[PDB]
Amino acid sequence: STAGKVIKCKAAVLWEEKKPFSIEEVEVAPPKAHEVRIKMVATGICRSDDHVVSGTLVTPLPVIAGHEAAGIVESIGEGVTTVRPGDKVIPLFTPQCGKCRVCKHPEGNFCLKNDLSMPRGTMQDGTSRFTCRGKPIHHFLGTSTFSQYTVVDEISVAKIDAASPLEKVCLIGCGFSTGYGSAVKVAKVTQGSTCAIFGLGGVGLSVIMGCKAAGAARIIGVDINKDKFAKAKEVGATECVNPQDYKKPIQEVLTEMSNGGVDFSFEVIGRLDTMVTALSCCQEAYGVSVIVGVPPDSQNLSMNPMLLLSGRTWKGAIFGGFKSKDSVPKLVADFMAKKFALDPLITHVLPFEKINEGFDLLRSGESIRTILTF
Amino acid sequence: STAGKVIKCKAAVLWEEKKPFSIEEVEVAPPKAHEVRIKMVATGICRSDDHVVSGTLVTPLPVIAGHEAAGIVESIGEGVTTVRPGDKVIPLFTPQCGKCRVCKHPEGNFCLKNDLSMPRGTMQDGTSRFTCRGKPIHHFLGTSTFSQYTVVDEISVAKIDAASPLEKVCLIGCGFSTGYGSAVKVAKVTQGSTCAIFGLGGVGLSVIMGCKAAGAARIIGVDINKDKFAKAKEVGATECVNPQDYKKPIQEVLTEMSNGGVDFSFEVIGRLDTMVTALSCCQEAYGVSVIVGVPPDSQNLSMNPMLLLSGRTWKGAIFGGFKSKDSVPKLVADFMAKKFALDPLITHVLPFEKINEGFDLLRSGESIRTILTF
Ligand SMILES: NC(=O)c1ccc[n+]([C@@H]2O[C@H](COP(=O)([O-])OP(=O)([O-])OC[C@H]3O[C@@H](n4cnc5c(N)[nH+]cnc54)[C@H](O)[C@@H]3O)[C@@H](O)[C@H]2O)c1
Ligand SMILES: NC(=O)c1ccc[n+]([C@@H]2O[C@H](COP(=O)([O-])OP(=O)([O-])OC[C@H]3O[C@@H](n4cnc5c(N)[nH+]cnc54)[C@H](O)[C@@H]3O)[C@@H](O)[C@H]2O)c1
Ligand SMILES: OCc1c(F)c(F)c(F)c(F)c1F
Ligand SMILES: OCc1c(F)c(F)c(F)c(F)c1F
Ligand SMILES: [Zn+2]
Ligand SMILES: [Zn+2]
Ligand SMILES: [Zn+2]
Ligand SMILES: [Zn+2]
What we know:
CATH topology of the largest domain in chain A: Quinone Oxidoreductase, Chain A, domain 1
InterPro entries (chains A, B): ADH-like_C (IPR013149), ADH-like_N (IPR013154), ADH_Zn_CS (IPR002328), GroES-like_sf (IPR011032), NAD(P)-bd_dom_sf (IPR036291), PKS_ER (IPR020843)
Distance between the termini of chain A: 20 Å
Strand content of chain A: 15-25%
Number of strands of chain A: 19
Subcellular location (chains A, B): Cytoplasm
Oligomer: homodimer
EC number (chains A, B): 1.1.1.1
Number of helices of chain A: 11
Family (chains A, B): Belongs to the zinc-containing alcohol dehydrogenase family. Class-I subfamily.
Bound molecules: nicotinamide-adenine-dinucleotide (acidic form), 2,3,4,5,6-pentafluorobenzyl alcohol, zinc ion
CATH architecture of the largest domain in chain A: Alpha-Beta Complex
CATH class of the largest domain in chain A: Alpha Beta
Catalytic activity (chains A, B): a primary alcohol + NAD(+) = an aldehyde + NADH + H(+); a secondary alcohol + NAD(+) = a ketone + NADH + H(+)
CATH superfamily of the largest domain in chain A: Medium-chain alcohol dehydrogenases, catalytic domain
Helix content of chain A: 10-25%
Largest sheet of chain A: 7 strands, mixed
Largest interface: A-B, 41 and 42 residues
C-alpha cells in the first residue's frame, strides 16, 4: 500500500529556464484534507508548457510542469467526496471551486482560486507536496502532470468515464477543449459563417473542429508553416494561407477573401502582432475576434480603438470558456459517444522518459500533440 | 415655390480648425435623384461637432458640421419614396442603405455607405450641395445640420411622427440613442448588475438611462467634473466618483467598490487612457466594456492582452448599435408614449445665431445639451 505514505517516484523537474527537463526521483507527500493523489497515465505536451521553459510564461521555479493529462486516483484526503481511489480523472488547470462569483456566474469559468493570474506554484494551502534532492519543488497550475504521481486540490480534478482511453482523453485537459470551446462557446460561431484561424497547432486545429461542428461555411487556416495545412484541411479548413506568400499584410488578404472581413477570427499562436491582425480581419461592424494564444510576459500591444468603435467585438478566454469540473466529464462522455475525434491531434506517442525529445518535436514544427505515456 | 431652385440661407461655416463658426449666407442646391432637402428646425451641439473644431476628428474643411437634428422636408429629388414634402424628419449620420452586407446582418448597423471611417465630406455621389463666397463647402457625415437648409441622401433620413416636438426629438439623432443603445443593445445590461459609466455628458447620461431601464442595481458615474454628479443621480446613478479624489488609479477603486470588478463598463469621453481603464475595471472573467467615446485622430492605445485572455469582452459601437432608419422612428414613437425622457439632457436653449455661445457653454463644462432653434 502507498496510501498515507510518501511516494518516491520519477518526475520531470525544471530547475531553471531554457534548460532540459531533468528526469529524476522526487518525493510526493500524501494528500491532506480535500486533496487527491493521482497516478498519471498519459500527459500531452502543450505549447504553454514550453512557454515555462522559454520564459514566455513566468511561474516560480524549480517546477514540475504539465497540465494536459489523465490518470487514476491512488488515494484521497479527508473530506474528498467527488472522486475515489481507482477512478479515472483529468486534472483541471483552471479550477472550479463552485463558490466564487465567477463560478456562480452563468458565463464565467476563470475561477478565482486559479494559479494562473498571479502564480504562487503551490497547492491551495500555499505549500508544496513535492521535494527533489532535499529541495521543495513548485506546482504548476495546481496540476503538475509531468510526474508519475501528483497531488491536486479537489476543485482541480474531475472524475471521468471508467472506460475512457486515457492516452487520448488527456487532450480534453487542455488543447482540445480550449480550441473547441473557443469556437462553440466563446465565439459562438454561426451556421454559414466565415472563420479565420491563426495558428494550426493542436489548439488551432481544435478551433477548426469547433467551427466545422458549428456549421461554418468557410474556415480559413493561417500559418507560416505550410506543413500544417494538410491536417488543417482534414479537420475542416476549406482553404489555407501562408502570410509569407503575400506582398500585402494578411489582414488585407483575408478581408479581400471574405468580401469585406470574416465573421469570426481566432488568434491561436501567442503573438501581439497576430492578435491585432486577427482583430482587424474580422468585419468592422459585426465581426468577433477571440484571443486564445498566450503572449510573452508583461508586453503590451498597440491598436487603434476605431477598430472597436465601428462595432467589432474582441474577447479572450482560458480553457475554451468551459467551467472545468462540470464540462470535462461531459466532453469525455461526448468523445465516448463519437461526437468528436481526438486522433487527428495526436502525431507522436512517446514514453515519459522521452519528454525532452517530445519538446524538441514541438519546437521544430514537426508535431501537433505528443502524448507521453508513463 | 423653392422646389428645383437654389436656396440662399444662413449656415454656420467652419473655415479653419480652432476658430469660431461663421454664420453667413450659403447657396444650397436642389436635391438630385434620391436626395432630400430639409428645412432645419432644431439641432443639438454634440461633442463630436466640437471634435471637428479641435481637430480630434479629421474631416475635410471648410465644412458645415452638425449631425444631431430634426426638420421638415422642403423638397424631394427624383425617385425618393420614403419621405415627402412637409414630413418631419431626423437626418441619419449613420446611413441605412438596406442593401449592404452590414444592413442585412441582424446585428450590424455601421452601413458601408457611411462617411465616418474615411471622411470625404460629400454627398453619396462625391459632390457638394453647398457653396459659400463662391467656394464649395464640405458636408459632414452626410448630414450638415448647422444650416437653415441641408440636402441629404435618402438613406440618410428617416420620417418621424408628424406630431413630434422637434426641439426635443433632435436628440434621438445622436446623443440619446447612442447612449441608450450602448447600454440596452450593445452591452445588453442585465437586471441586478453593476455598471460604471466614464463621462457624464449627454451621451453618458443616456447610457445611465439605459442601464436603469435594463434594471441595473448599481450604476456608478465617473467624471472629473463633480458638477456633473447631481444630474447623473437624477437619471439613475446610485453613486458618483471623481478620479481626482483618489490616490490610487480609478480602475482599482472601481474594482474594490464592486467587490472584484463591474459587470458592464462604458467609456463615454474619448480618451485612450480611460478606454483601457474602463476595460480593466470590468470583472476579468465575465465583464463587458463598451467604447463609445471618439478617440483623437490616428492615435493608438496600448494594453496588455491578458485583460482579454481571462475572459473580458471589449466592444465599441456607433449610434448605440441601432440600425438607424428602422430605429429612429420607433424611438420617436416611444418618446411620444413617455417610454423615456429627453428633458434631463437639455440644459440650455439658444437661437441658431448664437451657435458660438453654445459651443462656449459645452467647452466650459456648463452645459449637457444646448438645443439651437432656426
Ligand atoms: N487560452 C488557453 O486556455 C490556452 C490553452 C492552450 C494553449 N494556449 C496557447 O495557445 C497557443 C497555441 O498552442 P498550441 O496549438 O499548443 O501551439 P503550437 O502547436 O505551437 O501551434 C502554434 C502554431 O502557430 C504557428 N505560427 C507561429 N507563428 C506564426 C505567425 N506569425 N503566423 C501564423 N502562424 C504562426 C506555428 O507554425 C504553429 O503551427 C500557445 O500560445 C498556447 O500557450 C492557450
Ligand atoms: N459612438 C458614437 O456613436 C458617439 C455618439 C455621440 C458622441 N460620441 C462621443 O462620445 C463622447 C462623449 O460625448 P458627449 O457626452 O457629447 O460629451 P461631453 O458632454 O463632453 O461629456 C464628456 C464628459 O467626460 C468628462 N471627462 C473628461 N475627461 C475625463 C476623465 N479623464 N475622466 C472622467 N471624465 C472625464 C467631462 O467632464 C464630461 O462631462 C465624445 O467623445 C463624443 O465624440 C460618440
Ligand atoms: O495552455 C493553457 C495555459 C494558459 F492558457 C495560460 F494562460 C497559462 F498561463 C498557462 F500556464 C497555461 F498552461
Ligand atoms: O457623435 C457621433 C459621431 C461619431 F460617433 C463618430 F465616430 C464620428 F466620427 C462622428 F463624426 C460623430 F459625429
Ligand atoms: Zn471559483
Ligand atoms: Zn495548455
Ligand atoms: Zn448599408
Ligand atoms: Zn454625436
